[PDB]
């Protein structure tokens, strides 16, 4: 939004659990949904290329 | 009372036809008690609805 | 001590002992909290020079168990100073982008003392707090505002909201009730932040504390004297209807004005004390 993101403000998806308040949330901007994997050089390599 | 709550949920919310309810869905029947406890979000209808689709699916999901 | 009051069955008497008794067990400290308990001091069911002279035997008690109860301010303050000096030397230590300002900024850390009077703490803290959250924004390069006449907000830094939110609450909860401390559960120190945001985090709080217990003790204290003054006033006023010698004994008695909590002690031990010779004053039932 304006200010860079912070471990505060990533969270982390869940699946196959009811997650309402995160589906609420959606179109909003600050917290930034992730799936808890984080890509590796060689796939951040690969997907640049 | 919790069952008006539960029938104001059912048929506002979620817009659910009368064939199916609680008596008939157990995942509903689960659902109903975390959906009444958040008394906010209720404008926001479209969440609740995916909420339950995606309930159903992680059920009906088999290994 | 016998705090007594007239047209009152024993049982609101103990009521209103045991409510003055069991005051800083309760959170909404403020009388006004309590209508059920200014209620039962008489209203529309006596007169009104009875009823008058309950309210302010009621006030002076409960003002002299508020002075009773005032805490103690060191450890805050030596505690204050100590997380100031922490955040001073971490943030000497860090490799800021550009180290003019955050000189500056660290002197004004440096900078900060408490006098020997209570009444001064708030604006140095505000100063001292802003300082620190200008050096933790700038630790994590975040845009601090700039605008003509603005100023940084005071706010923690990279928390989470809901988080943030029960510190919010808890600091509520000590500007409803100053004598009891909520110790927190909630960990202020996280390893996903800089050692120097944590500082700052830390001493923030400590600088909220400290602000809301003082103002909310002068804001009580003042609305306290306001009341009792109110109440000597219009129960003089009152008084000047009739003039036997006990109606000019007790107008004698409430000459003296309170501005003081001195004053509202002697007063009240002075109206305790002659209570059996201008009692017959006041009519009843």
């Known amino acids: 939004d304006r200010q860079p993101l912070n471990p505060a403000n990533i969270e982390a998806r869940h699946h196959g659990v009811s997650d309402v308040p995160r589906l609420g949330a959606m179109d909003a901007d600050e917290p930034l949904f992730v799936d808890d994997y984080r890509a590796t050089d060689d796939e951040w390599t690969l997907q640049k290329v | ?63 | 001590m016998s705090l007594q009051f007239i047209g009152l069955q024993r049982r609101d008497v103990v009521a209103l002992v045991n409510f003055l008794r069991h005051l800083t067990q309760k959170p909404d400290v403020d009388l006004e909290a309590h209508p059920k308990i200014l209620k039962k001091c008489g209203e529309k069911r006596l007169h009104r020079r009875t009823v008058l002279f309950n309210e302010l035997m009621l006030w002076l008690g409960y003002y002299r168990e508020l002075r009773f109860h005032n805490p103690d301010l060191s450890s805050v303050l030596e505690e204050f100073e100590v997380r100031c000096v922490a955040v001073a030397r971490r943030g000497y230590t860090y490799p800021f982008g550009d180290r003019g300002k955050a000189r500056d900024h660290l002197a004004v850390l440096d900078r900060t003392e408490f006098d020997t009077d209570v009444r001064h703490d708030a604006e140095i803290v505000e100063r001292a707090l802003v300082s620190a959250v200008i050096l933790a924004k700038m630790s994590v390069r975040e845009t601090l505002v700039t605008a003509i006449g603005q100023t940084e907000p005071i706010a923690f830094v990279h928390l989470k909201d809901t988080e943030v939110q029960r510190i919010e609450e808890n600091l509520e909860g000590v500007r409803r009730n100053m004598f009891c401390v909520k110790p927190l559960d909630l960990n202020l120190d996280r390893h996903a932040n800089t050692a120097l945001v944590n500082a700052v985090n830390k001493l923030v709080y400590t600088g909220r504390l400290i602000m809301n217990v003082r103002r909310s003790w002068e804001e009580l204290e003042r609305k306290c004297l306001a009341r009792i003054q109110e109440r000597c006033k219009l129960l003089v006023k009152e008084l000047r209807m009739c003039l036997s010698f006990d109606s000019n004994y007790c107008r004698n008695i409430l000459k003296h004005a309170v501005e003081n909590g001195d004053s509202a002690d002697t007063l009240l031990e002075l109206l305790i004390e002659d209570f059996d010779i201008y009692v017959d004053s006041f009519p009843q039932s």
Do not use: G, Q, W
């Open chain 2, 1 to 63: 009372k919790r069952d008006e709550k539960h029938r104001h949920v059912v048929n506002v919310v979620l817009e659910l036809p009368t064939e199916i309810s609680e008596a008939t869905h157990p995942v509903l029947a689960t659902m109903l008690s975390k959906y009444t406890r958040m008394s906010s979000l209720f404008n926001d209808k479209c969440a609740f609805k995916l909420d339950l689709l995606r309930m159903v699916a992680v059920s009906r999901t088999r290994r």
